[PDB]
């Protein structure tokens, strides 16, 4: 069929923790491949995220 | 914490923006590691001269300016003059232990 048919939407925003590892004395963002993952911390981090 | 394996000096001759440069071994000396790009002499500018490896803190004459230019957190010896002449050291004094720079002697 096509006369039927979904629209395969845009997807979104996705929270994570496990990122977060610890820096043998604090955080430690440890992102795997293109993760801007949004982080902030008490003050305001790289919350267009980093795959730094 | 995170060894700051300073590189030695800021090399300058006439007055030039040089950077003294403060590697460190373990990751980069910043602000984390609050490299702070500190130009101290003994008594003298004793202190950060950067701010955390990022701007010009308390000892600065915007020679030892804080600026991480790499895993080196190069105090930034911008017009470095016959005063600017200091071990800016960008003294980690990071979250876990100091860790501090060895000496980026500005000269």
């Given amino acids: 069929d096509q006369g039927h048919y979904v629209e395969m939407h845009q997807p979104g925003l996705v929270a994570d923790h496990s990122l977060l590892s610890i820096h043998s004395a604090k955080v430690k963002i440890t992102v795997p491949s293109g993760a801007q993952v949004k982080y902030y911390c008490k003050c305001p981090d790289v919350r267009k995220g980093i795959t730094s | ?107």
């Fill in chain 2, 1 to 107: 914490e995170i060894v700051m394996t300073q590189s030695p000096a800021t090399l300058s001759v006439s007055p030039g923006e040089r950077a003294t440069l403060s590697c460190r071994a373990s990751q980069s000396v910043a602000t984390n590691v609050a490299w702070y790009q500190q130009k101290p002499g003994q008594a003298p500018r004793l202190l950060i001269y950067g701010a955390s490896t990022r701007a010009t803190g308390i000892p600065a004459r915007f020679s030892g300016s804080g600026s991480g230019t790499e895993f080196t957190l190069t105090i930034s010896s911008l017009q470095s003059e016959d005063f600017a002449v200091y071990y800016c050291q960008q003294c980690n004094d990071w979250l876990t232990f100091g860790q501090g720079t060895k000496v980026e002697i500005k000269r």
